Amino acid sequence: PTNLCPFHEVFNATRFASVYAWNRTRISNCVADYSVLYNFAPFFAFKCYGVSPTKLNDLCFTNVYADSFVIKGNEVSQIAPGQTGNIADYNYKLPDDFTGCVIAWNSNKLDSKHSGNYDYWYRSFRKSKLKPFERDISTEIYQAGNKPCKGKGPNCYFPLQSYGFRPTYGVGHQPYRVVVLSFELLHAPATVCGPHH
Amino acid sequence: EELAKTFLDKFNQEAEDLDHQRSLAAWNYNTNITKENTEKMNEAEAKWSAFYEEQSKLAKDYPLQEIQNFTLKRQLQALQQSGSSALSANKREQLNTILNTMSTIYSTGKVCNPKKPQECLLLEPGLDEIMANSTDYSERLWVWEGWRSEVGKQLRPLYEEYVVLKNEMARANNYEDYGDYWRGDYEAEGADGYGYNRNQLIEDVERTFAEIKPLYEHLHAYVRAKLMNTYPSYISPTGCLPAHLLGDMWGRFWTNLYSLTVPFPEKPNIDVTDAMINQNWNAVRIFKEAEKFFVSVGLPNMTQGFWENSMLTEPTDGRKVVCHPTAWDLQKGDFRIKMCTKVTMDNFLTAHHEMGHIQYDMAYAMQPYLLRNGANEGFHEAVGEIMSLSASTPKHLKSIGLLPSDFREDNETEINFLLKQALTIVGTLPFTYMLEKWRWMVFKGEIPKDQWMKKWWEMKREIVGVMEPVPHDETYCDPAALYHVSNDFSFIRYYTRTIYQFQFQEALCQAAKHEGPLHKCDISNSTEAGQKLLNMLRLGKSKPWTLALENVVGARNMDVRPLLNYFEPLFGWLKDQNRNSFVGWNTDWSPYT
Numbered sequence: 001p002t003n004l005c006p007f008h009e010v011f012n013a014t015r016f017a018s019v020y021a022w023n024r025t026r027i028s029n030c031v032a033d034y035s036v037l038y039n040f041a042p043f044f045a046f047k048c049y050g051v052s053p054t055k056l057n058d059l060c061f062t063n064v065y066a067d068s069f070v071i072k073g074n075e076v077s078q079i080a081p082g083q084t085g086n087i088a089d090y091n092y093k094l095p096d097d098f099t100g101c102v103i104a105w106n107s108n109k110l111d112s113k114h115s116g117n118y119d120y121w122y123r124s125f126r127k128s129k130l131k132p133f134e135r136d137i138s139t140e141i142y143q144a145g146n147k148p149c150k151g152k153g154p155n156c157y158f159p160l161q162s163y164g165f166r167p168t169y170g171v172g173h174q175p176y177r178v179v180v181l182s183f184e185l186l187h188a189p190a191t192v193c194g195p196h197h
Numbered sequence: 198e199e200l201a202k203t204f205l206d207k208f209n210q211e212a213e214d215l216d217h218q219r220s221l222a223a224w225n226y227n228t229n230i231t232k233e234n235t236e237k238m239n240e241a242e243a244k245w246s247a248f249y250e251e252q253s254k255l256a257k258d259y260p261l262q263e264i265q266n267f268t269l270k271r272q273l274q275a276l277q278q279s280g281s282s283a284l285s286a287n288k289r290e291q292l293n294t295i296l297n298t299m300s301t302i303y304s305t306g307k308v309c310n311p312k313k314p315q316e317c318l319l320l321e322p323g324l325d326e327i328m329a330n331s332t333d334y335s336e337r338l339w340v341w342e343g344w345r346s347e348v349g350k351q352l353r354p355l356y357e358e359y360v361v362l363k364n365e366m367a368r369a370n371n372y373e374d375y376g377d378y379w380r381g382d383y384e385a386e387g388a389d390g391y392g393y394n395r396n397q398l399i400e401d402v403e404r405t406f407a408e409i410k411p412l413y414e415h416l417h418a419y420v421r422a423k424l425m426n427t428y429p430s431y432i433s434p435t436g437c438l439p440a441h442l443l444g445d446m447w448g449r450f451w452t453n454l455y456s457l458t459v460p461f462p463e464k465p466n467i468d469v470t471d472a473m474i475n476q477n478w479n480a481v482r483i484f485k486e487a488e489k490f491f492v493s494v495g496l497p498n499m500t501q502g503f504w505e506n507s508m509l510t511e512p513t514d515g516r517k518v519v520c521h522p523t524a525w526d527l528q529k530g531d532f533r534i535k536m537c538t539k540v541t542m543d544n545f546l547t548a549h550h551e552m553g554h555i556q557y558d559m560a561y562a563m564q565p566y567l568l569r570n571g572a573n574e575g576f577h578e579a580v581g582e583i584m585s586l587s588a589s590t591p592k593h594l595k596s597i598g599l600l601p602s603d604f605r606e607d608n609e610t611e612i613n614f615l616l617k618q619a620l621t622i623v624g625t626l627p628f629t630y631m632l633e634k635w636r637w638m639v640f641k642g643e644i645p646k647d648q649w650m651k652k653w654w655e656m657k658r659e660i661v662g663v664m665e666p667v668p669h670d671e672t673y674c675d676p677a678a679l680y681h682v683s684n685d686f687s688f689i690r691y692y693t694r695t696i697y698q699f700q701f702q703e704a705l706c707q708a709a710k711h712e713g714p715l716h717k718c719d720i721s722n723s724t725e726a727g728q729k730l731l732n733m734l735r736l737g738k739s740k741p742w743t744l745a746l747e748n749v750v751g752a753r754n755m756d757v758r759p760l761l762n763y764f765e766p767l768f769g770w771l772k773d774q775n776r777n778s779f780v781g782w783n784t785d786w787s788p789y790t
């Protein structure tokens with residue numbers, strides 16, 4: 001297995017998924033250099049759970065999963081096991097047994113325009129909480145009241161929302177690009193393996 | 198049941214997008230005054246208030262007597278309050294044109310000198326300069342009367358139409374008048390005796406003014422004495438100080454008479470401007486010093502956007518800019534300060550003040566949109582100034598290196614310091630209270646407009662002890678020649694603030710366990726004091742300001758005691774100074790006019 005895992009191109013990507021409709025790419029059958037990741041190095045969060053940023057390039061796993069999206073600065077604290085908030089409750093929840101790594105770098109000069117990047121969205125309303133790795137792209141009007149509903153009327157809200165992304169926002173509201181790497185030990189031959197094993 | 202939490206949650210998230218828009222537009226106007234940016238401001242304001250209207254009615258549908266979460270109840274009451282949404286269509290844009298016009302007049306007005314008629318000159322930078330240095334009665338007088346003649350006369354008709362519309366909006370919000378809307382800031386709904394009804398404020402002001410009044414009076418007599426030495430025939434030894442002879446262009450702070458009134462002139466200087474001049478300071482260093490003081494106590498430093506987006510120098514671009522110092526929270530961790538900071542000690546302390554605002558705004562950003570305010574207008578200003586009280590002690594000035602290091606400590610220099618402090622703190626109290634009281638009257642209908650300035654100068658003479666140099670008919674609108682009056686800012690804050698301060702500093706000095714006089718206390722390098730204060734700046738308006746007070750000082754209302762005790766040595770000295778003097782003023786003599 002000599003071809004080198006395409007980790008670069010999850011990160012290197014003109015536009016990211018909206019957290020509510022977060023992407024996933026399956027790294028399957030290759031040698032795994034976590035090195036490229038530092039071609040986006042200025043990192044605001046680099047938190048591993050189960051393995052160590054200083055021990056990637058030695059990880060032998062059956063599979064790797066790379067989930068990507070755009071979030072507020074504030075909300076990066078929510079991409080962690082056992083966390084609570086809109087982004088983990090209705091958009092992207094992780095298992096408590098998570099083995100993987102959350103990676104998060106600032107993306108203002110790309111994802112923020114002087115007139116609001118309203119092409120970014122998150123789910124602010126849901127009847128109940130997503131389970132880990134659940135994903136939900138409904139646009140049904142949320143019904144707050146016992147009463148019936150109508151389009152974005154009262155007691156009856158449009159379910160998603162859009163971050164105004166503009167350069168003068170303070171850092172906690174700027175756009176951040178997030179990549180969760182999930183390391184999968186299955187019972188099968190391990191074919192995402194690192195340079196140093 | 199509580200679909201209130203949900204409605205409020207959608208509201209928070211739209212309203213902060215829209216309020217950032219409005220704030221940016223207002224900023225872009227305040228730092229680049231053009232026709233175009235004026236109109237882009239009008240359009241941002243239109244969208245804000247069109248939005249707030251629907252959200253306000255939509256909220257009035259949730260009964261506030263079913264809400265038991267006092268937090269959500271404070272939010273829902275804030276929102277059931279339809280400020281601006283009260284005025285409507287023609288009258289929301291009419292108001293806004295009136296307001297833009299007053300604003301651009303105030304910050305574009307130029308007055309010329311009879312001596313060199315080709316010398317027209319602006320207030321925000323230059324006429325201020327004259328009013329701070331000069332000691333020429335006729336020079337000062339032509340600048341004072343020229344400002345009031347050439348802008349106050351331009352503002353009069355505007356102030357009138359402004360008062361009718363602002364009052365209409367207040368009545369539409371179920372207030373007696375606009376002055377009842379502004380005093381509603383001090384209204385709080387908690388429990389036991391943590392409530393506060395608007396109509397207490399006027400009592401509670403008038404109580405404290407009385408307790409302040411003796412001290413002011415003595416300071417007044419003394420300042421008159423020294424001013425007689427520089428203007429012998431223009432000032433009576435028993436009457437009033439002329440209005441154009443004080444620290445600045447109004448009688449607001451007496452902090453430019455220190456030179457004329459320094460008790461023991463042959464000693465280390467409390468004013469420290471000369472020092473900065475030779476110490477080669479600039480705007481960026483004054484603010485880096487404010488920043489260091491706030492970190493020294495344990496507060497955040499300033500954001501990058503604060504440095505990359507604020508106005509600290511007056512722009513040399515050709516750009517025309519409203520220069521009055523203001524601290525902006527544009528709702529998104531987008532904090533700025535708009536100030537034309539010049540290298541003096543006065544700007545150094547005001548950088549302390551306006552950064553104290555920014556620090557409060559950063560502090561309560563954990564709170565939901567509708568609760569991100571001060572506990573009351575005063576607290577926001579007060580916080581700016583508590584730090585200042587410490588930033589200003591000689592001991593700290595010495596630590597800065599701005600004083601000469603050598604230890605010439607003595608009551609002598611403590612009297613020097615207490616007087617420079619009285620000139621700015623105590624001096625401003627009657628001017629402030631009298632200004633707001635005039636406005637409260639004008640709003641309540643008690644002054645016919647055929648007697649506006651008649652009741653201005655009358656209250657001036659009676660309450661402040663200040664008389665006018667030339668007579669002013671109702672073609673003037675002097676009161677509007679101040680930023681706050683013509684730029685629609687509540688003014689009684691600068692009263693409550695001055696009292697709330699010594700209540701805070703005293704408490705925050707007890708924490709630092711500073712022994713001895715409250716006026717030699719300095720909370721620098723005191724992380725426990727910073728912690729004491731931040732715990733309550735983190736509340737904002739989420740709790741009754743009365744409890745917010747008790748949380749740090751142990752009072753539920755204002756208390757002149759710490760202020761009086763801070764200035765007590767100066768009271769004793771000043772009293773001696775006026776043993777063979779009349780401690781008071783009479784509105785009989787005039788200065789020819």
Ligand SMILES: *[C@@H]1O[C@H](CO)[C@@H](O)[C@H](O)[C@H]1NC(C)=O
Nearest residue numbers: 006008009010011012013014
């Ligand atoms: C990402 O990789 C592809 C590989 O062909 C390249 O064409 C693209 O330009 C890369 N992105 C950037 C920003 O260079």
Ligand SMILES: *[C@@H]1O[C@H](CO)[C@@H](O)[C@H](O)[C@H]1NC(C)=O
Nearest residue numbers: 010013015016017023068069
């Ligand atoms: C999402 O997946 C698509 C699949 O074609 C891919 O092209 C795109 O780059 C991904 N976007 C990201 C990085 O979220």
Ligand SMILES: *[C@@H]1O[C@H](CO)[C@@H](O)[C@H](O)[C@H]1NC(C)=O
Nearest residue numbers: 229231232233234235514516
């Ligand atoms: C100031 O305003 C003008 C017109 O309103 C605008 O075109 C210009 O870009 C502004 N200048 C700046 C941003 O300094």
Ligand SMILES: *[C@@H]1O[C@H](CO)[C@@H](O)[C@H](O)[C@H]1NC(C)=O
Nearest residue numbers: 202205265266267268269565
């Ligand atoms: C009030 O509601 C807030 C959310 O708006 C919640 O965090 C808090 O716990 C509630 N307090 C109560 C139920 O007393």
Ligand SMILES: *[C@@H]1O[C@H](CO)[C@@H](O)[C@H](O)[C@H]1NC(C)=O
Nearest residue numbers: 493592593596597719721722
């Ligand atoms: C706070 O500590 C600094 C750092 O040594 C010192 O320069 C300063 O004088 C201290 N502040 C005081 C003594 O008020």
Ligand SMILES: [Zn+2]
Nearest residue numbers: 550551578581
């Ligand atoms: Zn202020």
